[PDB]
């Protein structure tokens, strides 16, 4: 039986070094808990970047996969499968959009959104071909494709990865005057923005920012693209993080928790006047819309609905942030977030940083990832209960004040 | 009980119109057979673009998925999981490369290969930053991302989709002189090519083109990237189509049959000097390398090995091409292919075409899809047997001569 150090050394020898994970080798997961190969038990306070909002191996999602895998898993889109239309009707009625375009990973949904915005910009808005612009916010993250890192302001994402995709403008985040200035270019076809910036360090914009984006985009006839791949599906306390200001984006991107972690499923939602600019043969994906991922996506959505995970994430997130703000200011310098998507800012020194705090948190039974050496994210599964949350808060307080 | 027509209209109402599939609504699949919602039984001669080489719902792959879904499905790569290193050692030793970078979809493996080539071009070869070029062959297909369509010579894939990715040069397929001409530029970092062009219509290059490409790339210090996402994993009669010419590419792209159609799993294989140009935090993906997909990948590869599907694809492919060449020259003008990846060219008129041939093949219990109005692909799962193949050949004969 391989030990933890045996697992690390194997991946180091046979796997690419594109990651430096926290040294812990998990083998089992259920609900909010993870178990390493030595049997130790941990609070999962990362949730695989909100991909297991429903908890690890939720039985209802597991049973949908097990039932469908015996029947049919992949026909490709050259033919019809019987499950896709069921999932399509369900999700478009749920979020109240005309249609959905199914993909697999989150960056594939973002690529589809950029392609929809350009095609709509040329064939509907009438922009001169191949001058269409898409505006992004600084600190944005929507994948690791060449196009995704082309709009990135993070040097680690784009440094050394070749000439970059043109047609992408970058403005500061949480800045309405900068968006107004950017939207003066009549070649702008879309503004793609996260309601909360996850990988940037759980950056929450000021109240009214989302209404301002919706108003500005409407006034200049520009597509409002909301990337809810991380913020959506009850993680911030609502079905969509844009529900906190009640704005209707033109294009909504879903993913991650869309399958509870059991299958790579993403989705792109918009109305007919945007969706139907793409004709047959002009876009798609091999596994996109396969019957297996559709069954787990139907079940993963039903778990969020019938277990009221959005409400639980809302009231539990207020407890988490309030308890975190009691830590001394000379240790944590900021606590922010919405619902169960939160982060703390560490007064980093030369000797003490967020990585060491996470190593000690692991020692005390709580797993979390640092995002920038002074930021630590706390995002547990939404099925957590108040007592389990308070137990984890005890682990956080003890670890933080033990330095 | 939704009927076949009901399934068509439901997807039309709530789903994007990016496809025009053959009108047949499948709900069950096993081995080489597919069943529609009315209970009719079909031969599958597309294999979901070689994604179910092992047949639909192979019990060994299904059992691997059913066993792992209850333990653990997704930790993200911020932590370690016990399954990934097992798959990494298995797939690297199997194909004889140092390391593997796991991704989900085929286009994501292509994007990863491009990022590896560029990072290798700047950090190892010494190209000034963002002058690196990647050469592609006309008629190529490797996904629908912005980067992917930026190298396509098919207008239906790049038309109306905005500014394109710089640094992508295109040369004619099956053209060694054009390749050396393109490689005279020292800023070229890689050449990505399919050993047999699938979506182009099963375009098999001349003998020696592969070892010539291998020789030209090595001479000019250029990375040879072989896209075996469709040609690899026994579909053409070998583990990799390049094995027919003993060619070892610098980077191999695998995908799609890598999971037997049960999960989106793709792989990027290369040695240390190429792979380790990407440092921790510089590339990744949420679902890339999750334990659930690694288990079904190990089982999918094991099925291909211990069932000798490459030898089976080699033998039966010879029979299939032999029988197909017995068709008259005024109806079928060309028959090409390696192993069980084959295609026929239809003497298309205004009267009849390949779509009507595939419609009537569907009527006679065999599913296949045309690729260009005059090309029809015949690619059944590699678990097919000779008598089952000959029954299908009879169906292919009687439909063609029925026009
Ligand atoms: C998901 N990214 C969250 C952090 C994961 C980093 C990593 O690469 O390991 C995310 C995406 C991309 O989704 P995929 O990783 O391609 O499935 C896009 N947009 C948002 C808001 C995300 O959180
Ligand atoms: C897979 N062939 C794509 C099948 C076309 C149907 C569709 O819906 O697009 C393939 C890829 C792309 O892999 P992914 O679709 O991204 O998983 C890349 N390269 C080759 C040679 C393929 O066969």
Residue numbers in the entry:
A (entry chain B), B (entry chain A): 37 to 439
Task: Provide passages from the article that reported this PDB entry.
pmcHuman ornithine aminotransferase (hOAT) is an enzyme that catalyzes the transfer of the δ-amino group from l-ornithine (l-Orn) to α-ketoglutarate (α-KG). As a pyridoxal-5′-phosphate (PLP)–dependent transaminase, hOAT has a “Bi−Bi, Ping–Pong” kinetic mechanism. In the first half-reaction, PLP and l-Orn are converted to pyridoxamine phosphate (PMP) and l-glutamate-γ-semialdehyde (l-GSA). l-GSA is then prone to cyclize to Δ1-pyrroline-5-carboxylate (P5C). In the second half-reaction, hOAT catalyzes the transfer of the amino group of PMP to an α-keto acid, preferentially α-KG, forming glutamate and regenerating the PLP form of the cofactor.
The structure of hOAT crystal soaked with AVA revealed an intermediate that closely resembles the gem–diamine intermediate. Unlike other intermediates in a typical transamination reaction, the gem–diamine is an early intermediate in which the catalytic lysine, the PLP, and the substrate are covalently joined together, and the observed electron density can be fit convincingly to such an intermediate state. The carboxylate group of AVA formed a strong hydrogen bond (measured as 2.2 Å) with Tyr55 and indirectly interacted with Arg180 through hydrogen bonds via a water molecule, and the Glu235–Arg413 salt bridge remained intact. That this intermediate is observed in the crystal indicates that the lattice greatly modifies the magnitude and relative rates of the chemistry, in that no evidence for a gem–diamine species was observed for the same reaction in solution. Internal aldimine and gem–diamine were found anchored by the side chain of catalytic Lys292 tilting the pyridine ring of PLP. Thus, the observed AVA gem–diamine intermediate is likely resulted from a trapping effect during crystal soaking. To the best of our knowledge, this is the first experimentally observed gem–diamine structure among all hOAT substrates. Of all chemical species present in crystallization condition, only the phosphate group of PLP possesses the right geometry to fit into the observed electron density. The electron density observed in the Ser186–Met201–Phe204 site likely represents a PLP bound only as a crystallographic artifact.
